[PDB]
Amino acid sequence: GNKYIQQTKPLTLERTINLYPLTNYTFGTKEPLYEKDSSVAARFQRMREEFDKIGMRRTVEGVLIVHEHRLPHVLLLQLGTTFFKLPGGELNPGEDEVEGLKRLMTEILGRLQDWVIDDCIGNWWRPNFEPPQYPYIPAHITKPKEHKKLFLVQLQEKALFAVPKNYKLVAAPLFELYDNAPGYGPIISSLPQLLSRFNFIYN
Amino acid sequence: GNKYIQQTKPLTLERTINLYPLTNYTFGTKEPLYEKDSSVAARFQRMREEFDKIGMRRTVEGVLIVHEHRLPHVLLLQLGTTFFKLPGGELNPGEDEVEGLKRLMTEILGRLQDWVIDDCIGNWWRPNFEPPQYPYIPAHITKPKEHKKLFLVQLQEKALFAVPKNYKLVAAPLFELYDNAPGYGPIISSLPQLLSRFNFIYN
Numbered sequence: 001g002n003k004y005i006q007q008t009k010p011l012t013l014e015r016t017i018n019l020y021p022l023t024n025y026t027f028g029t030k031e032p033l034y035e036k037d038s039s040v041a042a043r044f045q046r047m048r049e050e051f052d053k054i055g056m057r058r059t060v061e062g063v064l065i066v067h068e069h070r071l072p073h074v075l076l077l078q079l080g081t082t083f084f085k086l087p088g089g090e091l092n093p094g095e096d097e098v099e100g101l102k103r104l105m106t107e108i109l110g111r112l113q114d115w116v117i118d119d120c121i122g123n124w125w126r127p128n129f130e131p132p133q134y135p136y137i138p139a140h141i142t143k144p145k146e147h148k149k150l151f152l153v154q155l156q157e158k159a160l161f162a163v164p165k166n167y168k169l170v171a172a173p174l175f176e177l178y179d180n181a182p183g184y185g186p187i188i189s190s191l192p193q194l195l196s197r198f199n200f201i202y203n
Numbered sequence: 204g205n206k207y208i209q210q211t212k213p214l215t216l217e218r219t220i221n222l223y224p225l226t227n228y229t230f231g232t233k234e235p236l237y238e239k240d241s242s243v244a245a246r247f248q249r250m251r252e253e254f255d256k257i258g259m260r261r262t263v264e265g266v267l268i269v270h271e272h273r274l275p276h277v278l279l280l281q282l283g284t285t286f287f288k289l290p291g292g293e294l295n296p297g298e299d300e301v302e303g304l305k306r307l308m309t310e311i312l313g314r315l316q317d318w319v320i321d322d323c324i325g326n327w328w329r330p331n332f333e334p335p336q337y338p339y340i341p342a343h344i345t346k347p348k349e350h351k352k353l354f355l356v357q358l359q360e361k362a363l364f365a366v367p368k369n370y371k372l373v374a375a376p377l378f379e380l381y382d383n384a385p386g387y388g389p390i391i392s393s394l395p396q397l398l399s400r401f402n403f404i405y406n
Contacts, residue, residue, distance in 0.1 A: 011213070
């Protein structure tokens with residue numbers, strides 16, 4: 001006649017994430033961090049070169065979320081009038097995805113901080129040495145040139161970031177990103193969709 | 204000196220889903236299932252009426268995935284030249300989300316079948332009694348008129364569906380849906396993005 005107390009619903013079905021006020025975070029400056037490639041031409045030339053040497057490029061990026069007045073905002077790094085990027089970068093050959101993201105996160109925003117990364121939110125592939133990227137591997141494409149993996153990085157209640165001088169740390173509300181590929185690209189603009197399944201607790 | 208065998212990585216970090224060939228599925232016909240609303244006007248009129256009586260409309264939809272030549276395809280129901288929908292519908296007041304989806308799935312595609320639903324893939328809200336929907340609750344909107352929740356429904360190796368005569372069961376490849384809101388709407392067209400985090404095993 002005994003009955004078992006039910007277990008918390010699977011995290012795959014209901015995933016709760018705690019968000020904190022924008023005012024809980026601050027930043028201090030650090031020396032500028034220049035882009036590895038000076039132009040679009042140099043960018044794809046380096047991609048072609050490395051592809052022959054080490055294979056497909058493996059990129060990882062973190063999505064840090066905060067809120068203001070119960071509205072989720074994604075932290076972005078502004079490098080130009082219309083150039084925004086997520087914190088992250090290229091993994092080294094054989095390097096573990098999550099450990100690599102933690103290394104890259106510390107390099108870009110690190111003050112000792114221990115990043116919490118327990119959720120994969122998406123994947124994007126670049127089939128050719130061209131700008132187009134897709135959220136799936138195109139048919140008949142057995143050698144994508146780049147694979148980008150996005151992770152949700154949970155922030156602590158309060159945090160201090162160290163931002164390179166040439167970057168501006170901004171908090172972008174979802175309504176600013178949604179259907180705004182012209183302003184943020186295909187990856188950042190679809191973050192609202194990718195974050196919709198999360199049950200955010202607005203602290 | 205003992206060492207603990209490591210546990211399988213969290214399902215939040217790496218979620219594996221088994222897919223099966225398109226040829227593993229078949230369908231048989233059943234009596235036609237007419238739409239509850241005959242026009243756009245009647246649709247929003249009914250939404251307004253029910254909103255005053257029972258509150259926000261709660262819709263649930265299932266995303267069934269199969270594959271052909273290692274390419275994910277989403278099952279859709281075609282009702283018109285350019286009208287496609289996901290299987291699902293409106294939940295009854297107080298009804299549990301997953302149990303409701305299972306009921307709706309059986310009503311629309313049911314042959315005894317036991318649907319496996321362990322993953323939420325997204326949420327969409329309709330702020331007003333108008334067509335626009337968003338993957339987040341707009342700022343200053345405390346009473347959305349409709350809340351649509353999408354779930355990933357895992358199929359068995361083989362299955363037989365019973366499809367209403369006025370519907371055509373189709374398998375849409377991701378490349379057909381991606382960035383094709385004109386052809387499928389904002390929800391179905393962003394399924395490629397929403398499914399990118401899954402590690403599909405192509406059986």
